[PDB]
């Protein structure tokens, strides 16, 4: 039921300022027993699930934010309200970053 998983931190908004959260994290996509698809973020130290968003095809895109040199930053963009959530890849190698991005989009928008 865990379709996609990868190490990544999240970010926080205070006022109008986006600040990366340094917590070790895991982004994952889980299909639940009702067949719904959840985009989740959990704290890898505590096991605390902080983000849990039910996403249907065409609701979202997940994309690299290429202009940031200080991390491998990705954005989960919602059509609804132009809402954005930022994540930053935490695997020590970058080899699988684009693959993880591809699989997020696949399972949210065009699953097997």
């Amino acid at each position: 039921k865990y379709l996609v998983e990868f190490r990544a931190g999240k970010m926080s908004l205070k006022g109008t300022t986006v600040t990366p959260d340094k917590r070790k994290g895991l982004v994952y996509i889980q299909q639940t027993d009702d067949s719904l698809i959840h985009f989740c973020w959990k704290d890898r130290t505590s096991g605390n699930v902080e983000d849990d968003l039910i996403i249907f095809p065409d609701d979202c895109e997940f994309k690299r934010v290429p202009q940031c040199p200080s991390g491998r930053v990705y954005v989960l963009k919602f059509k609804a309200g132009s809402k954005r959530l930022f994540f930053w890849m935490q695997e020590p190698k970058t080899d699988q970053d684009e693959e993880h991005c591809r699989k997020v989009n696949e399972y949210l928008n065009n699953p097997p």
Partner: peptide
């Protein structure tokens, strides 16, 4: 510090 996304 060491950077926003650095430990």
């Amino acid at each position: 510090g060491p950077g926003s996304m650095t430990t």
